[PDB]
């Protein structure tokens, strides 16, 4: 039975092997939509070459590469199973992986979708909170794909561009957070500080009106309401790259800072991610939870498990898609509004790309 509804899952993607690091980094630092750099066409290759060695080592420390592909697949397949049941009219569904900087690229996925003769195409972002740097860049890629070849899509497009407070997403983090608290020494539980660690963004992106920080902050609130404020918490930011200013406080300074101030029991939460990858398995689990923790003398620092294979997360993706279809909306209302200080000509086009679809 021919596939009827295609769900394109969008994310950054990561290198599968050490041999894939360099090209991954080149594509990444060349992407003006992610972040701007002077003479980016020439600076990117320089950055890529210089950075490749230490990143390769980091990947070797966590198994030899990023597992983002396998988790995205496990989540997609689970979503499809529930969709075929939840929405019979939308015939069989099929998910497509659209990574921004590694195979399968966003462009390759779209081609396969067109090749499949689908009727419906849904750009489903895997970034729950929207940033023009993440979901925005991935969507711009879909627009430019058709714009370059200069042909109209052979399928109906629509997009779920964000879902920062979806109740099942909130329940997963809350569930994962409770299971972690249960593992601190009992007499230290009520003292544990919950640090929600979202990926940071350069202030050059934040100060243009990026929706990201506010949406992340929204995810944090919901989760803490569900936990009914059982513990104190803070929203900190990880993974800053380069010397320019980024949104702080940084997760590392925060962990170090709490530890030197009497708060030696910390629970980390990768609130802006959907699966394990370098940002969690290496940065949070090794760099901070092993090295930094040991040097500052932390008594207990743990991290809530990533959404990964949680059945409930799969239920969340399917429910979002089903509701999306039932609604007939082409995109969120927020997508119809670009950054007040947006200076990217493509944004206007991408926006129109989804708001233009008939049916």
Pick out the residues of the known binding site for [2Fe-2S] cluster: 132, 339, 342, 347
Rounded CA-CA distance 130/119 in Å is 27
With CB under 6 A, what is the number of residues at the site for ligand FES? Answer: 7
> What three-state secondary structure class fits 220?
helix
CB 110, CB 142: distance < 8 Å: yes
Site residues for ligand FES, 320-359, by CB under 6 A, read: 338-339, 342, 344, 347
**Which does residue 14 bind out of ligand FES, ligand PP9, none, counting CB within 5 to 8 angstroms by kind?**
ligand PP9
Tell whether residue 28 is a contact of ligand PP9 (CB under 6 A): yes
DSSP 286: I
166 is catalytic: yes
* Six token digits for residue 174: 């809350």
Among 22, 93, 162, 199, binds ligand PP9 (CB under 6 A): 199
Question: Is residue 136 within the footprint of ligand FES (CB under 6 A)?
Answer: yes
DSSP string, 42-109: HHHHHHHHHHHHHHHHHHHHTTSS--HHHHHHHHHHHHHHHHHHH-GGG-SEEEEEEESSSSSBHHHH
Max distance between CA atoms of the chain, in angstroms, equals 64
C-beta contacts of 289-293 below 8 A and 24+ residues apart? 292/252, 292/255, 292/256, 293/255, 293/259
- What is the C-alpha to C-alpha distance for residues 135 and 140, in angstroms, rounded to an integer? 8
203 binds ligand FES (CB under 6 A): no
Among 7, 10, 12, 86, binds ligand PP9 (CB under 6 A): 12
Binding of residue 3 to ligand FES (CB under 6 A): no
Residues numbered 41 to 60 that lie near ligand PP9 (CB under 6 A) are 51, 55
Q: Quick check: 141 binds ligand FES (CB under 6 A)? A: no
- SS3 of the chain: helix, strand, coil, percent, to 5: 50, 15, 35
The one catalytic residue among 166, 176, 199, 324:
166
Sheet (strand 5-11) strand order: 93-99, 5-11, 120-125, 156-160
Among ligand FES, ligand PP9, none, what does residue 28 contact (CB within 5–8 Å per kind)?
ligand PP9
Is residue 142 a contact residue for ligand FES (CB under 6 A)? Answer: no
Residue 235 binding ligand PP9, by CB under 6 A: no
CB of residue 141 to ligand FES, shortest distance in Å: 14
State the catalytic residue, choosing from 33, 199, 319, 324: 319
- 51: tokens are 């950075």
Is 10 or 258 the residue whose CB approaches ligand FES more closely?
10
**78 near ligand PP9, judged by CB under 6 A:** no
Cβ nearer to ligand PP9, comparing 39 with 359:
39
Task: Tell me the C-alpha to C-alpha distance, in Å, between residue 137 and each of 12, 34, 57, 84, 214.
Answer: 10, 6, 28, 29, 19
Map the footprint of ligand FES across residues 115-134, applying CB under 6 A. 132
What is the spatial distance between Cα 257 and Cα 239, in angstroms, rounded to a whole number? Answer: 17
CB of 98 to ligand PP9, least distance (A): 13
Instruction: Assess 106 for contact with ligand PP9 (CB under 6 A).
Output: no
Q: Is 237 exposed, middle or buried (0-12, 13-18, 19+ CB in 10 A)?
A: buried
Strand order in the sheet with 193-199: 233-238, 193-199, 265-269, 300-303
Binding residue ranges? 51, 59, 66, 132, 339, 342, 347
CB of 91 to ligand PP9, least distance (A): 31
Active site residue 276: no
27 touches ligand PP9 by CB under 6 A: no
**Is-contact 190 151, C-beta < 8 A?**
no
Residue 308 interacting entry, from ligand PP9, ligand FES, none, C-beta within 5 to 8 Å by type: none
Q: How far apart are CA 260 and CA 243, in angstroms?
A: 25
Instruction: Give residues in contact with ligand PP9 (CB under 6 A).
Output: 11-12, 14, 28, 34-35, 51, 55, 66, 68, 127, 131, 133-134, 199, 201-202, 205, 241, 272, 277-279
Give me the active site residues, please.
166, 319
Instruction: Give residues in contact with ligand FES (CB under 6 A).
Output: 132, 136, 338-339, 342, 344, 347
């Amino acid at each position: 039975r021919k596939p009827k509804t295609g769900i394109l899952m969008l994310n950054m993607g990561g290198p599968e092997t050490l041999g894939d690091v360099h090209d991954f980094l080149l594509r990444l630092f060349l992407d003006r939509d992610l972040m701007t750099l002077p003479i980016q066409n020439k600076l990117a290759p320089f950055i890529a070459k210089r950075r490749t060695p230490k990143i390769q080592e980091q990947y070797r420390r966590i198994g030899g590469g990023s597992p983002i592909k396998i988790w995205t697949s496990k989540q997609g397949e689970g979503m499809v199973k529930l969709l075929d049941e939840l929405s019979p009219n939308t015939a069989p569904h099929k998910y497509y992986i659209g990574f921004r900087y590694v195979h399968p690229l966003t462009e390759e996925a779209i081609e396969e979708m067109e090749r499949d003769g689908l009727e419906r195409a849904i750009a489903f972002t895997q970034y729950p909170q929207y940033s023009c740097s993440t979901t925005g860049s991935s969507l711009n890629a879909i627009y430019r794909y058709y714009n370059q070849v200069g042909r109209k899509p052979t399928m109906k497009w629509s997009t779920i561009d964000r879902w920062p407070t979806h109740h099942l997403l909130i329940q997963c983090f809350a569930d994962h957070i409770l299971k972690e608290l249960d593992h601190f020494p009992l007499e230290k539980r009520s003292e544990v500080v919950i640090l929600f660690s979202a990926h940071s963004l350069p202030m050059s992106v934040v100060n243009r009106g990026d929706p990201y920080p506010q949406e992340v902050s929204a995810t944090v609130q919901k989760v803490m309401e569900r936990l009914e404020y059982c513990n104190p918490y803070r929203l900190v930011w990880q993974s800053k790259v380069g010397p320019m200013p980024w949104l702080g406080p940084q997760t590392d300074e925060s962990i170090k800072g709490l530890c030197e101030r009497g708060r030696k029991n910390i629970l980390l939460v990768p609130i802006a991610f959907t699966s394990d990858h370098i940002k969690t398995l290496y940065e949070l689990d090794i760099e901070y939870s092993q090295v930094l923790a040991k040097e500052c003398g932390v008594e207990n620092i743990r991290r809530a498990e990533s959404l990964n294979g949680n059945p409930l997360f799969s239920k969340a993706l399917a429910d979002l898609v089903h509701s999306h279809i039932q609604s007939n909306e082409l995109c969120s209302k927020q997508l119809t509004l670009s950054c007040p200080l947006c200076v990217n000509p493509v944004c206007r086009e991408t926006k129109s790309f989804f708001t233009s679809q008939q049916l």
